[PDB]
Design a protein around this ligand. Structure first.
Ligand SMILES: [Cl-]
Ligand SMILES: [Cl-]
Ligand SMILES: [Cl-]
Ligand code: NA
Ligand code: NA
Ligand code: NA
Lengths: 183, 183, 183
């Protein structure tokens, strides 16, 4: 019911300019606004699909030759948005699931399918290094629920050859727990 | 009326040693002291030109084959120094200006010219990744003042082919403001 | 009397899974658990040698083709462990010593020899960028003690061609001290 918009620029100044322009252009939330090596800039927005399409249209329209890439992912479960900008609260501890993908697009699509095909909580979506790099989702819930979520997410990414690894970790060790659910 | 000294080493231990040596050698402020990938070390100093020349002389004199590069930038407006080490306080909000350059030297020279050719506040000078990488200056003030500052800075960097992008952003959006003026 | 175990994986999810598995497998402390560019994962453990051998055995046994590298360093002075995970308290200020190496293995072995061949405090062991990159140890104590420690450490690393630089810094400047002993 929500949408994610991604805009990547070769200029950090243009990135900040376009972040400003897009936020003014439509009712959208800023999820990510950061510099990526070597010196590119990444913006990710969340909001209604109409708003996101117009925001990304505005951004692409004004990027010129500084435009690197852009994407709109429609019909994304609402919990995915705060999982990109930060952390969702864990309401169950029994198990953690982690699915690692190439690309944040594959990760987002897999996380969406996971949440929609199970009763797990999507805790966070992490990008190790920009939108083309290793990304991973972390889910939490009952072991059976986590297994379902991880399977669905893995199938999503794997169909594309973009699954790196999947892991179901019941009863995570106390010394790993914080890193898993908070980073 | 002030000067900036830059010393880059291939050794982190030598960098810390030379930071110590230079600070003892003259009355200078440490502005930056950090490791840069792959494993080099960056020192930037501020102070009177005489002190900075002797500090950088000392540093270069003792660097040996670990010396990567060194520079002294003379007659730099005093506000540029704290803009490199941290943030200057914003006394006006009406507009933000951002000028992105290749190299911190070009950024410093452009920021100096901007401050000297306008009434803007130089808020900060940011290096994304070491002294040769993308850098940018952020200024704040009245829209007309910011436009002047950005034009002057852009001309400085552009004459060298080192201007990446320039942006005048009146009335920055609330969700971009903090990143612009604080990073 | 203690041991350090190192496990490196090509998968971040596998890394977190293996961190969990190894911690459950034996009585070991997690010293490091982090992602390294481009997208690998690094685990370092401390504990009794028996526990560490079994933990690393477990980790290697389950890593499969995601295994990048693994190492067990036996008979490491106990102070080296907290120097890897964080900071040891400085009980003397007179001098700082810094020895920079290629590889954390060389750094650990050099730090161990330094501590065992002197009365210095090992303050910290730092990895700039993963286990193969620039690393350095920082020691503190009386100038004579620091000189001994640095010489011993330098000989250790230098015999292998893995010494980058060694530095004895009596009476470190106030503006460098915190970075030296805390990072
Ligand atoms: Cl559940
Ligand atoms: Cl102004
Ligand atoms: Cl001592
Ligand atoms: Na649990
Ligand atoms: Na404003
Ligand atoms: Na001292």
């Amino acid at each position: 019911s929500q949408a994610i918009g991604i805009l990547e620029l070769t200029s950090i100044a243009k990135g900040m300019e376009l972040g400003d322009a897009m936020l003014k252009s439509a009712n959208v939330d800023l999820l990510v606004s950061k510099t990526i090596s070597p010196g590119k800039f990444l913006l990710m927005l969340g909001g209604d699909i109409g708003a996101i399409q117009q925001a990304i249209e505005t951004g692409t329209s004004q990027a010129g030759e500084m435009l690197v890439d852009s994407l709109v992912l429609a019909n994304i479960h609402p919990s995915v948005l705060p999982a990109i900008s930060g952390l969702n609260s864990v309401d169950k501890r029994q198990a953690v699931g982690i699915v690692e993908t190439w690309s944040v697009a594959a990760c987002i699509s897999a996380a969406d399918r996971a949440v929609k095909g199970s009763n797990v909580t999507l805790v966070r979506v992490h990008m190790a290094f920009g939108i083309g790099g290793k990304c991973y989702m972390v889910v939490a819930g009952d072991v059976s629920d986590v297994n379902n979520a991880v399977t669905v997410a893995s199938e999503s990414a794997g169909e594309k050859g973009l699954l790196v690894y999947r892991s179901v970790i019941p009863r995570p060790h106390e010394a790993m727990w914080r890193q898993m659910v908070e980073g």
